[PDB]
């Protein structure tokens, strides 16, 4: 047994009884992991200076009725993962100075607690997780008015009679996740602040009416349940977080302070007009994996504060966003929908947009301000704030010239658009700012864009395009990664690939038909420190 | 933060009625009810026509091998169930009660052997054998009994044709009770160690280990009705019409 | 029809329900202690492999306490009472060989050591415990009975048992657990 300063450590294994050869001035004492089977008052009472006592993971099953009342200076006591459920006799008595008590993993049951645990004036935290409780009666928690936190997850609770929390006037955290509750009929805990009811079977949720003072609740979690309607939360004016993901909700000031609302994986199909009007302060909103077909924000000044909107994997077909609306939006995710034809100036009215993801739709970009394209194309010509764009798998046949003329974006992605042909000057304007470019899987014969002018380009991806010849670098460009796998490169002259050695870091060729003749530069690179 | 004690079930009753409508039409394979005929009297022939828990728990298995032919101190175990052996018309008797790889599995005729034995006792055949025993070790408003019980149980309801369904063409009977099933079945979350009084809740709240249990009927009964077309009456019986119990499945 | 609910959570909940089902059919508060008894005597395996093997009309074409009189009366037709129809599944084969998105059987395999973490089961090493899933079309209709508390649920029809050989202390135990493998489904 190690000792340092009024503290004793007893190791993982090797004991069957409480030791007695310890100094009598100890103040901490650890015994987890051993093979203890009971706690008798005699050896333990010698240590009247204890303040912390850990007895978890043993096999303790019997506690002498007076064992813990000799210790008058405790503050913490842990008895987790023992076998207390086999204990008529035994139990804990008064515990005046205790402030924490852990009883999780013991397999207790309803009715045993009122005899197991006695008085506790100074308790602040109590943990009863991972037991076999089923019902909370008016008699359960008694004589503990300083309790503040109560952890009851991973039980089997089905009932909560009225008054079970009346003896707790200072509680502020309640945790009832992973239980078996089915219907909630009332809510009257004025002073509570955090409530966690996730992973249950709750079908309906309703709160009280006409309180003396407003409820203080500010954090509510009801994800992964069976709710069928958006709950009525008119009496909770302080709420800041709310999470209703993975339910069955269908849609048909209360929420003037909500800042986070998650509403994914439900069965919503149409959004009433007045619903979005109340949410004045919202900053994040997810509506992914629902069944919407349109989204409207026509009214000017609606959603003033929103910074993220998520609509992926719905079935949208049009977007009626009006100008001077969504003026703060920065991220807009729309992948997996069926958008085809849009008004030309849809995305150019968003004043702060910075990241757009359009993968999997069938959008065809415009052709620059000068000589635009046909009707129904979308204009990416002048979105001054945009910084990232994704157009994977949109079946783009033709990429017109000047498509991104006045958008100083720093990342593009055009992969998996077979039969793509890039008109000359299509990528004009991006030389000064573009950093990443991907064209994998397109299959184009020859690349018309003049790469060596791209000063800032760092990563480039050209895999699975069936190229055979590549333009020539003749300076110290900033490129650092280059991918050419599964192309048709046979010979790599050192003339065209000079100047890249100043900055190149890694590189790939596997899958190409390299020729044994020549290729001295490639051999030199393989000799050098460049990866592969 | 109370739990939930009372729930209204008018919507379930009205949806049940609406479904009974279409169900009876389909059982009678019409796309619309026939318009009522004139009030007619029943003949005498129709009048004469009118006058006229141990499955849940696991079993130990004990095999007792052999020591128109005859088959015959086996009171070691004192278990229940009968044979399933390794190998015209041909059938089997006892020393002469009729009993029937093969199988003759009733949970008896070795209960009697356990109870009383004689000099010879065995099975007959007439115009690697063994036995297999199975028994559970010892340690292992028709159908609900509390007013507005919150469990899965059967609820009462009365169906009468002229009022609810507007069916003038139904003559017998005036109505009947079409009870329904309601109440939730909670999903119980498992653990490796759990108290022995909670191990009895699986048998009734989720016996099938489904991911979402449902409250579904268990016993159902048929309904006989009478109706006229033209001059000829028609006596038709429909099946699966009245509930007698429920179940969580 | 809008039926967006992810398919990995259904698998996770079916497996976690299987755990409690197996533990409570045997009535075990804690899983037994594994032993390295790799040499199981051959006789025990014989028991395991042998268990694993197993209008209305009345009287007293012409028409248009109980016995099975159906054959003779049907032959004659072309005290007794007769019923005559007036002149006017979702099993493994159909679901596994054809694509369906209503109520239907889905496949699942349970390995005791990889899914549940149990090292005390000698035989078998795992089994196929399917499951039922999918929505039901609201009002099949020839056989349906609308009696549940909502739209009909997707519940199993046929179920088959399972044989396990586990080991308690120093003795072997050959069990049989009922209703373990799904084979068909129905809408209520």
Numbering used by the authors:
A (entry chain I): 26 to 112, 116 to 280, 312 to 591
B (entry chain B): 1 to 52, 74 to 88, 107 to 111, 122 to 136, 143 to 150, 160 to 164, 176 to 202, 252 to 264, ...
C (entry chain A): 3 to 56, 81 to 86, 121 to 124, 177 to 190, 254 to 263, 278 to 328, 341 to 389
Provide the authors' own sentences about this structure as they appear in the paper.
Transforming growth factor-β (TGF-β1) is a multifunctional cytokine with key roles in development, immunity, cancer, and fibrosis. Latency of mature TGF-β is determined by non-covalent association with its N-terminal prodomain cleaved by furin during biosynthesis. The prodomain encircles mature TGF-β homodimer in a ring-shaped disulfide linked homodimer “straitjacket”, (latency-associated peptide, LAP), forming L-TGF-β5. Interestingly, both TGF-β1 and -β3 LAPs contain the integrin binding motif RGDLXXL/I and bind to two integrins, αvβ6 and αvβ8, which together account for the majority of TGF-β1, and some of TGF-β3 function, in vivo.
Single particle cryo-EM studies provided structures of L-TGF-β3/GARP (2.9Å), comparable with that of L-TGF-β1/GARP (3.0Å). The portion of the straitjacket in contact with GARP almost identical in both structures. However, L-TGF-β3 is significantly more flexible in all other regions by B-factor comparison to L-TGF-β1, particularly the arm, which contains the integrin binding site, and the portion of the straitjacket domain, including the lasso loop, that cradles the tip of mature TGF-β containing the receptor binding domain. Such increased intrinsic flexibility suggests that L-TGF-β3 is less constrained and contains higher basal entropy than L-TGF-β1. We hypothesize that increased basal entropy facilitates exposing mature TGF-β3 to TGF-βRs even without binding to αvβ8. To test this, we expressed L-TGF-β3/GARP and measured TGF-β activation using TMLC reporter cells, which, indeed, has significantly higher detectable basal TGF-β activity than that of L-TGF-β1/GARP with no basal activity. A detailed comparison of sequence and structure reveals that the lasso loop of L-TGF-β3 (lasso) is not only shorter than L-TGF-β1 (lasso) but also less conserved in key residues interacting with mature TGF-β53. The high basal activity of L-TGF-β3 was unexpected, which we attribute to the increased intrinsic entropy of straitjacket and lasso loops compared to TGF-β1.
